[PDB]
């Protein structure tokens, strides 16, 4: 059917403060990408472990369709598994169901184009479990919302407001913390790739996931126009949290 | 009076494209601060015409109260002029009317202290007119939400995601842009000033406005913690834009 959104606090994934987080994030592997693409341990979509994502979020609001609430498991077409994938182990474990998804590619203006993939998953855990992901050196990033003078020229027009990436840091950085999930919780789950490569697909679902590539070019200098489609993703904030049933989401 | 919020674009006040706008932001005199603290042409409250704001967005929808719409005016109770104030001619131009307001400080909880000030007010304007800002040489800043690590060890928890400024560019800019409002719609004017020295009030509401400060800390480092209180102000987004009847918006202090 049609999308619904969240309302709501977006919760981290952990049982000591299940504090408050206001966006989504992506880790990125900086030590053996040069190797062979990046392939860790995470939060992967149904049998493809190569998508994984290190960011999920808990969802204890509610969901809407204008004034109206919703269940997402009423509203779901298609649905998979949620799995867990340890790269130490090889085990893919069970983690949730999917009933809702988003999907997006962002490309950025001017010619050369850069693009960012995100997929976000809305899933119910079906077990009560903890896990940390990989060692190794990362950066990391979110979107966030920039103004900024309208051109080069020393005299600006009404300041634009585009997407560009925060990416950090200069230090070194090691993202093996801890999520902890609660059987019968809601979470999100967001696959958020720069500049990728290659895609792999839910093809029941015509659902994709970018891979974290090997390489990228800079993260720095790009501006994404902030579109319409763009909203509700996750990519530039937690705003308006928008799903759609599994297999009705937008086409990428 | 309990609080409202906008639901629709916010659009650029320029007649020719309204387009979308997705961030308040603020302008900083870089240019004459060191002589005298910046007062410059833009749209104030009433006759407080120190406190001046170059950010002002067209807000074409509708305002909720739960399900049910409601007419800001039906909702108001306290009301005032706002205004544009020109530093050249000296002469206060009435704009249209404040029906709605919200107001905010962001404090920082590290080592250094540092407040944001942020007040929105939510009018109809009365006139159809535009203006252009004063010419000065300037900065730009919007608040970010920013993803980091937890801290300054190697190994991170979860990360954080807090508050920071983007605060642009390097190179010369001047914002002399101009704005355009037609009679009858609605509009937000932002004023938001980082490491403020000074604030002015309307007493009758206790509203406050911070003024320009002519010197300030370095902007880049701070971070803030995102608050509660601090979603619907317009700081770090504007999602969810909220606002009160006039006089009846949370506490400054
Ligand atoms: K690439
Ligand atoms: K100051």
Same mark, same amino acid.
């Given at each position: 059917?049609? &999308?619904?959104?969240?309302?709501?606090?977006?919760?981290?994934?952990?049982?000591?403060?299940?504090? #408050?987080?206001?966006?989504?994030?992506?880790?990125?592997?900086?030590?053996?990408?040069?190797?062979?693409?990046?392939?860790? =341990?995470?939060?992967?979509?149904?049998?493809?472990?190569? &998508?994984? =994502?290190?960011?999920?979020?808990?969802? $204890?609001?509610?969901?809407?369709?204008?004034?109206?609430? /919703?269940?997402?498991?009423?509203?779901?077409?298609?649905?998979? &598994?949620?799995?867990?994938?340890?790269?130490?182990?090889?085990?893919?474990?069970?983690?949730?169901?999917?009933?809702?998804?988003?999907?997006?590619?962002?490309?950025?203006?001017?010619?050369?184009?850069?693009? /960012?993939?995100?997929?976000?998953?809305?899933?119910?855990?079906?077990?009560?479990?903890?896990?940390?992901?990989?060692?190794?050196? #990362?950066?990391?990033?979110?979107?966030?919302?920039?103004?900024?003078?309208?051109?080069?020229?020393?005299?600006?027009?009404?300041?634009?407001?585009?997407?560009?990436?925060?990416?950090?840091?200069?230090?070194?950085?090691?993202? #093996?913390?801890?999520?902890?999930?609660?059987?019968?919780?809601?979470?999100?789950?967001?696959?958020?790739?720069?500049? $990728?490569?290659?895609?792999?697909?839910?093809?029941?679902?015509?659902?994709?996931?970018?891979?974290? $590539?090997?390489?990228?070019?800079? $993260? /720095?200098?790009?501006?994404?126009?902030?579109?319409?489609? =763009?909203?509700?993703?996750?990519?530039?904030?937690?705003?308006?949290?928008?799903?759609?049933?599994?297999?009705?989401?937008?086409?990428?």
């Amino acid at each position: 059917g049609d &999308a619904y959104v969240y309302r709501g606090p977006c919760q981290e994934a952990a049982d000591p403060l299940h504090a #408050a987080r206001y966006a989504a994030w992506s880790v990125v592997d900086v030590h053996t990408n040069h190797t062979s693409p990046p392939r860790w =341990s995470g939060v992967v979509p149904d049998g493809q472990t190569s &998508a994984w =994502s290190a960011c999920t979020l808990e969802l $204890p609001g509610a969901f809407y369709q204008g004034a109206q609430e /919703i269940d997402p498991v009423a509203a779901a077409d298609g649905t998979f &598994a949620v799995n867990h994938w340890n790269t130490t182990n090889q085990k893919l474990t069970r983690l949730g169901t999917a009933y809702g998804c988003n999907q997006h590619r962002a490309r950025t203006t001017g010619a050369e184009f850069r693009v /960012i993939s995100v997929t976000s998953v809305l899933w119910r855990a079906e077990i009560s479990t903890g896990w940390n992901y990989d060692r190794f050196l #990362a950066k990391l990033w979110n979107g966030t919302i920039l103004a900024e003078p309208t051109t080069s020229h020393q005299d600006s027009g009404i300041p634009l407001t585009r997407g560009g990436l925060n990416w950090v840091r200069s230090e070194n950085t090691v993202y #093996a913390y801890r999520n902890q999930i609660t059987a019968g919780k809601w979470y999100v789950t967001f696959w958020m790739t720069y500049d $990728p490569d290659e895609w792999v697909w839910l093809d029941q679902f015509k659902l994709q996931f970018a891979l974290h $590539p090997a390489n990228w070019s800079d $993260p /720095i200098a790009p501006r994404w126009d902030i579109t319409e489609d =763009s909203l509700g993703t996750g990519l530039w904030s937690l705003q308006d949290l928008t799903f759609y049933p599994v297999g009705h989401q937008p086409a990428a």
